[PDB]
Each structure stands twice: as structure tokens, then as C-alpha cells.
């Protein structure tokens, strides 16, 4: 039903300006990186944001994929973030899949982006410190202005 509209290479940074990357175990993590470090570390730092449909109130229906040794797409299934081995779809039948996120700017702050899970309404991509690592997780939005669910998206 909905054909892919656009496909944008992107560097994604979290609330503390750390850059998202896929590690050798296919885990989404963040680390402090200059724009130079981010290029040095491609393709593990370069995310393909594929857009399928405007669905405001919630946002733009997108998938987020990365190409390293294989192409993986981000999934929020079971409220657990993972990279799933699959290509972004040419066409989606609807916007309900666990690989769909609604990308929306934070109201009033046009360059701060949120990514809301389609399949789990009110849950969002977030950065969270676990032990030594900074991880990409899915988090319930418990209050407004939670910077951990806000990102910078740089076009490439």
C-alpha cells in the first residue's frame, strides 16, 4: 500500500551528543565521537532512514537500517530494541509493524527528533547508560521534555 518515499543516510546523536553505532555483536550503542571519528567509523555509524507515510499526529512513518556485513533494520518487538536481519521494505501494507517508528520533532524545538514505536504506542527510542555502555533502548515516555528520547539527525 505505502511505497517508500525517501531514503536518507544519517548520523544520529543522543542527548549528550554521543553518536549511535552498531557494534560487532550487532548491538546499538552510543559513544563520544567527533564528526571525524564518525566518518572513520562508517559504515557502523551511518543509518538509513526510510520514509513511507506522513501520519501526523504521531509523525512520519520511518524505518531505520544499517549496512555493515549485512543489512539490518531496527525492531521494537516485545518492547526490546534489536537489529533484525532484513532489508527495509519497498512497500508496507500499513504503518503497524514493529520496524516502523514515527519520527516527529519535539513540539517547539524543530531540530530535536523523537522516534515513537508504531507497535508500542507511547514508547520511544532512548539512550540509557548501563554499567560502562550507553545503549539504544525502547523506553516508555513517562514525562514531557525527557531529553533521553531526543536526538540530533545529521544528513549525509
Amino acid at each position: 500500500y505505502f511505497g517508500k518515499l525517501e531514503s536518507k543516510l544519517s548520523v544520529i546523536r543522543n542527548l549528550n551528543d554521543q553518536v549511535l553505532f552498531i557494534d560487532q555483536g550487532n548491538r546499538p550503542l552510543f559513544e563520544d565521537m567527533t564528526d571525524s571519528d564518525a566518518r572513520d567509523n562508517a559504515p557502523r555509524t551511518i543509518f538509513i532512514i526510510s520514509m513511507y507515510k506522513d501520519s501526523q499526529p504521531r509523525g512520519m512513518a520511518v524505518t531505520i537500517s544499517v549496512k555493515a556485513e549485512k543489512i539490518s533494520t531496527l525492531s521494537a518487538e516485545n518492547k526490546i530494541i534489536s537489529f533484525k536481519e532484513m532489508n527495509p521494505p519497498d512497500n508496507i501494507k500499513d504503518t503497524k509493524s514493529d520496524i516502523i517508528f514515527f519520527q516527529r520533532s519535539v513540539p517547539g524545538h524543530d531540530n530535536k527528533m523523537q522516534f515513537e514505536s508504531s507497535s508500542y504506542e507511547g514508547y520511544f527510542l532512548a539512550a540509557e547508560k548501563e554499567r560502562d555502555l550507553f545503549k539504544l533502548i525502547l523506553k516508555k515516555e513517562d514525562e514531557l521534555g525527557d531529553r533521553s528520547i531526543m536526538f540530533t539527525v545529521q544528513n549525509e
Partner: antibody
Amino acid sequence: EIQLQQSGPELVKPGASVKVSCKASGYSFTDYFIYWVKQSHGKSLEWIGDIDPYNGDTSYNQKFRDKATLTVDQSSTTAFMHLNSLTSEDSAVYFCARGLRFWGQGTLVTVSA
Amino acid sequence: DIQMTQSPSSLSASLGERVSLTCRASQDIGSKLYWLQQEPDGTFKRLIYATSSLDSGVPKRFSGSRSGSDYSLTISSLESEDFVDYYCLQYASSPYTFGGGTKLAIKR
């Protein structure tokens, strides 16, 4: 304990300006925006604006964008709202909040000559 | 801007009664609604977030639901402390906007 501690009630003259403060404690200040809300007799609750304490970015209700100026002081983990050009219509209780979840106790501002 | 029409602005009821307050949004806000309670001294407490999630430390008699562009806060059985003010708030779009409030009063 998450706390937002607001400054005391103010009595201020029409045409003057006032600056009210909102001291945050019990969490990492720069992880959450601070919101400001006006409660009046005449217009009930109105959102004024917000601020990102990490970079100072602000958003306003267009009704209040030339009335209110939001700032923070990172070191003291305090948010401020400055109101200019005061009139009787600015008399109200002003609240700060984290997340529109945790709220300050409010600051009454009375404008009178 | 999105207008949140909150009704009724006053509701008279009795201890033990089940009551429901409603907020109607002028545009689609999805699940992006809070319900707030305010005590007489001005203290706010959030009750419900994201339409139907109950905050911690809120009595279980409070619940939130949606049916269409109507959002409701239901109190299953009123207690004395419940006869205060209530407001909804939408966060779908800027500027964030509040309902005009409901005061819960004692019937006589």
C-alpha cells in the same frame, strides 16, 4: 526527592519587570526540560514556554513570546522566568514543572500601582 | 492551536458515587493527554499520563480512557479528598493546551 522550589510571592508595579526562580534538585538538571505555566482567574491554565537546560534552547506560546524570557543557570540548577512590561492581566500564579509531572509550588505575582 | 474542551466545569456528586470528567480535543491528539489534580493550596499531582497510564502513588480508583476525540477520567467511588480540581493537558502539538478544569463539589 525530586523538588522544584520556587521563589516567593511578588508585588510589582505596572510597566515594571519581575524575575521568578525555580530551583531544581534531586535529579540531573540537564536531563529534562523545564516548563512554565500561568494560572489565572481569567484564562485558567496556560502553557508559557519551556527551556532545555543543557543548551539553553527555548520554546514559547506565541501569546507569551514577547512577555516572558526563560533562562537557566546550570551551576545553581535553577530556571528563571522574566516578565516584562507588566500589566494587570499578568497578575497570576506562575508554576514551573519538570515533565508537567513534578511541579513547583507556584509564585503569585500581583501587578498593582 | 488545539482547544481542549473540558466538561463539566463543575460536577456535584456524593461520597461513593462513580463519576467521569471529559476532555474533547479540537484536533487529533492520539494518546497524548495527561490528567492533573490540584489541591486547594495549589499543589499539582499528575494522575494519568498517555491517556490511560496511572501514575505511581495515585489511588487505584482513578482511571483514564479514551473513546474517539473524547478522553475521560473516571473515579470509581468518590472519597472525601477527591472533591478538588482537575485539568486535562494535551501534548500532541505546540502550544501545549489545558482543559478549562472541573471542580468536584458535594451534592446537597
